[PDB]
Amino acid sequence: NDWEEPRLDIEGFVVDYFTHRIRQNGMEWFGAPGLPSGVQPEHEMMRVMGTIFEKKHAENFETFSEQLLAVPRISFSLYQDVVRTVGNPMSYGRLIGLISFGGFVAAKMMESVELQGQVRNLFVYTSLFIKTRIRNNWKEHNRSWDDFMTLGKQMKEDYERAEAE
């Protein structure tokens, strides 16, 4: 029960990642909610994991976001239908994929007169969807944020070495 710490609230990861992915696209999320404890090292590890994940699933990401944006006003139900298979139950893979995808779509919605106003809802859906799945599925599945960092640094290094090859 470490994902219960206020320091690691899911919102913190979603907000920090959305902000980072949007800035990566040269834009600025003016409506971004505050980060009570500020950037956490686990956030900075989520930035890398999301970047790596996006690069690996870019094509499928294009499809899912076009599905999610098929309807002007995004609903929680539609969100769940589109995100059902992201990260092919809340493993680190699905976790990273959900945040990565959320950040990806948010960046597509930014500076869009009709879409910009739903980046906040995307943030909430993402945070809520992950909250549930984690709370009731992480204790039994034996996962945690600490276990996350261990696997993360490994993936961070592989990527670095791989791209440097």
Side-chain angles (χ1 to χ4, degrees), residues 2-72 74-134 137-138 143-152 154-160 162-164:
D2 70 310
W3 58 82
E4 285 168 44
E5 298 185 6
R7 195 181 67 77
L8 302 179
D9 289 316
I10 250 307
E11 288 73 17
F13 292 77
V14 187
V15 171
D16 182 86
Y17 189 75
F18 273 40
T19 302
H20 169 71
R21 186 54 183 77
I22 290 174
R23 283 174 172 166
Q24 224 50 46
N25 198 35
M27 294 166 188
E28 183 63 39
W29 182 17
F30 268 45
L35 232 46
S37 303
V39 178
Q40 299 305 302
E42 290 80 359
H43 293 337
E44 275 159 48
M45 177 59 17
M46 180 59 78
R47 295 181 188 182
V48 175
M49 296 293 251
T51 305
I52 295 181
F53 191 108
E54 184 181 321
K55 290 192 172 192
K56 296 190 168 182
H57 301 282
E59 180 181 87
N60 274 193
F61 264 26
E62 287 304 334
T63 292
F64 297 150
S65 64
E66 283 184 44
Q67 294 186 326
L68 197 64
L69 310 181
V71 182
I74 305 172
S75 61
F76 192 43
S77 181
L78 193 184
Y79 167 77
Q80 288 175 257
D81 298 329
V82 168
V83 144
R84 185 187 178 185
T85 71
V86 173
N88 290 278
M90 183 52 75
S91 66
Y92 301 117
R94 196 187 189 189
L95 172 61
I96 297 172
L98 293 176
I99 294 184
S100 186
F101 179 60
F104 177 76
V105 185
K108 276 191 184 293
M109 301 171 91
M110 285 288 154
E111 300 206 9
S112 169
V113 171
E114 60 269 56
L115 270 22
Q116 176 158 130
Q118 292 181 69
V119 171
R120 188 192 168 69
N121 282 161
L122 213 208
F123 145 66
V124 183
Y125 296 167
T126 303
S127 303
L128 189 170
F129 190 96
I130 299 184
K131 271 183 161 175
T132 312
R133 310 295 179 306
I134 291 186
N137 206 193
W138 266 32
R143 4 225 188 196
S144 63
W145 284 114
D146 304 291
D147 198 297
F148 169 75
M149 293 301 266
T150 298
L151 283 56
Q154 302 184 354
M155 293 184 71
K156 179 177 182 176
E157 302 184 304
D158 302 309
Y159 178 64
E160 300 178 302
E163 298 309 76

